[PDB]
Amino acid sequence: XXXXXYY
Amino acid sequence: XXXXXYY
Amino acid sequence: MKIEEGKLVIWINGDKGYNGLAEVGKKFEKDTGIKVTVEHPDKLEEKFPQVAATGDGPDIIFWAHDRFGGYAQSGLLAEITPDKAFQDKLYPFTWDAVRYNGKLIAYPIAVEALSLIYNKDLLPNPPKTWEEIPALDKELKAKGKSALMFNLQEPYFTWPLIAADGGYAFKYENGKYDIKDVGVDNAGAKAGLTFLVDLIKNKHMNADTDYSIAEAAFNKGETAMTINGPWAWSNIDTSKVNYGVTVLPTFKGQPSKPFVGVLSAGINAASPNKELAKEFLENYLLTDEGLEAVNKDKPLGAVALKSYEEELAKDPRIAATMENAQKGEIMPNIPQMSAFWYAVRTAVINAASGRQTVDEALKDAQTNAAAAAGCKXX
Ligand SMILES: *[C@@H]1O[C@H](CO[C@@H]2O[C@@H](C)[C@H](O)[C@@H](O)[C@H]2O)[C@@H](O)[C@H](O)[C@H]1O[C@H]1O[C@H](CO)[C@@H](O)[C@H](O)[C@@H]1O[C@H]1O[C@H](CO)[C@@H](O)[C@@H]1O
Ligand SMILES: *[C@@H]1O[C@H](CO[C@@H]2O[C@@H](C)[C@H](O)[C@@H](O)[C@H]2O)[C@@H](O)[C@H](O)[C@H]1O[C@H]1O[C@H](CO)[C@@H](O)[C@H](O)[C@@H]1O[C@H]1O[C@H](CO)[C@@H](O)[C@@H]1O
Ligand SMILES: OC[C@H]1O[C@H](O[C@H]2[C@H](O)[C@@H](O)[C@@H](O)O[C@@H]2CO)[C@H](O)[C@@H](O)[C@@H]1O
Ligand SMILES: *[C@H]1O[C@H](CO)[C@@H](O)[C@H](O)[C@@H]1O
Ligand SMILES: *[C@H]1O[C@H](CO)[C@@H](O)[C@H](O)[C@@H]1O
Ligand SMILES: *[C@H]1C[C@@H](N)[C@@H](O)[C@H](C)O1
Ligand SMILES: *[C@H]1C[C@@H](N)[C@@H](O)[C@H](C)O1
Fold this sequence. Notes:
Oligomer: heterotrimer
Shape of chain A: elongated
Strand content of chain C: 15-25%
CATH superfamily of the largest domain in chain C: Periplasmic binding protein-like II
Radius of gyration of chain A: 6 Å
Number of helices of chain A: 0
Strand content of chain A: under 5%
Number of helices of chain C: 16
Largest sheet of chain C: 7 strands, mixed
Distance between the termini of chain A: 13 Å
CATH architecture of the largest domain in chain C: 3-Layer(aba) Sandwich
Distance between the termini of chain C: 27 Å
CATH topology of the largest domain in chain C: D-Maltodextrin-Binding Protein, domain 2
Bound molecules: a molecule of 4 linked components (BGC-MAN-BXY-RAM), a molecule of 2 linked components (GLC-GLC), alpha-D-mannopyranose, 3-amino-2,3,6-trideoxy-alpha-L-ribo-hexopyranose
Main location (chain C): periplasm
InterPro entries (chain C): Maltose/Cyclodextrin-bd, SBP, SBP_1_CS
Radius of gyration of chain C: 21 Å
Protein name (chain C): Maltose/maltodextrin-binding periplasmic protein
Subcellular location (chain C): Periplasm
Family (chain C): Belongs to the bacterial solute-binding protein 1 family.
């Protein structure tokens, strides 16, 4: 993980 | 807005 | 926002044969009155999820299959239902690449594998091993050239070396991928990344080298070798460099093991043109004629359609593509792939820039890749 979103 | 990130 | 009833919007990467695809779409429109617009946005695979449902997304998205499981988990892709007779038209393993949670979620188009591309005039006999590349560079440097340039910014290009001596993404166990068991920090992965960092430390490659830099360098005859996929052959053809396509070099005696993509066409689950998309893909695109049109624009690789692949197999460049593909692995399509690629991207950049040691970089990658994550990000 480590990134964000939201998809 | 309403989206996310983080860039 | 461009989706409309009775029209099709298609996204495909800008290095692929989008003009050839537009031509199949032109034929589709003559036959059905359904206009087909092909677009090639930057980072289309990252853009897709957030614009698919209500935004300016496409009716059809073309990308390697590894991204598709994640899309499907979020309900973004229409299940496809080709009949057994149509399925029998394509190699069985290509259907497996686009099967996720028991369902087909895209049409397989072509198998993309990385190969070693070399300048026959600068280097009539390419190296069999990664280990001999430093010496070859020193030689070529003396003549104002370099041995090898390829895209270091995308982990797709460096993974084959990292995997060669034992690096792996997720452990396959009890018939499924174990998302908590990541193999990017084992002995083989460390050896692979260490060799890469050393190439950079000893000035045989540049840590900021990217796709466009490596392509120009090779196509302008300044570097003897590059690593790239079939789509790249068209531009080399234009350059008139006398090139060969061959098996990737071994590392510690083991084949480079590229992660292999199956270029696939997914249908937007929120498109009001799903039936239209199915018809285009099954009856127009996945035909000898449709694929030839895209292939003659930019080569596809080893196509999924048996009848056409049998014609392409005569090409030694395709034979090389297949050989590298067989020594690698079709990518998993599980949602956790994007976390994996992100972890490796980060580790490679940090290690190559000297901002972390290999051991530190890969340890962090293993930790991050394994972090639990739900279907909406993380
Ligand atoms: C960012 O959102 C996450 C996730 O939000 C929850 O789950 C998502 C799927 C759902 O859509 C949403 O409605 C929630 O149920 C939250 O857990 C984070 O806290 C949130 O971080 C922002 O807000 C917190 C404070 O609550 C800040 O400390 C963070 O720095 C974030 O704030 C910035 O990010 C936002 C978007 O740019 C801005 O509002 C703010 O600049
Ligand atoms: C980030 O969002 C997730 C929510 O994600 C959604 O729900 C989870 C269960 C699911 O697995 C995922 O796919 C989505 O559906 C929240 O659960 C996290 O708490 C949130 O983490 C950030 O925000 C929280 C506070 O709300 C922080 O405690 C975390 O450290 C994260 O912080 C991020 O925002 C901070 C900016 O203030 C930064 O430190 C960091 O970028
Ligand atoms: O580098 C990580 C990246 O690799 C793969 O992307 C390839 C793609 O499969 C090829 O078709 C071509 O477009 O080059 C891309 C890499 O630059 C994965 O498919 C992708 O998900 C991943 O992020
Ligand atoms: C912030 O900027 C990035 C880069 O343009 C976008 O991709 C993102 O959607 C947001 O607009
Ligand atoms: C969720 O999945 C999307 C599509 O693959 C990524 O672009 C995003 O960064 C995250 O991994
Ligand atoms: C996060 C907020 C916005 N991007 C939504 O579309 C997703 C589902 O959750
Ligand atoms: C959010 C987490 C990750 N995307 C970081 O790169 C940014 C700056 O913040």
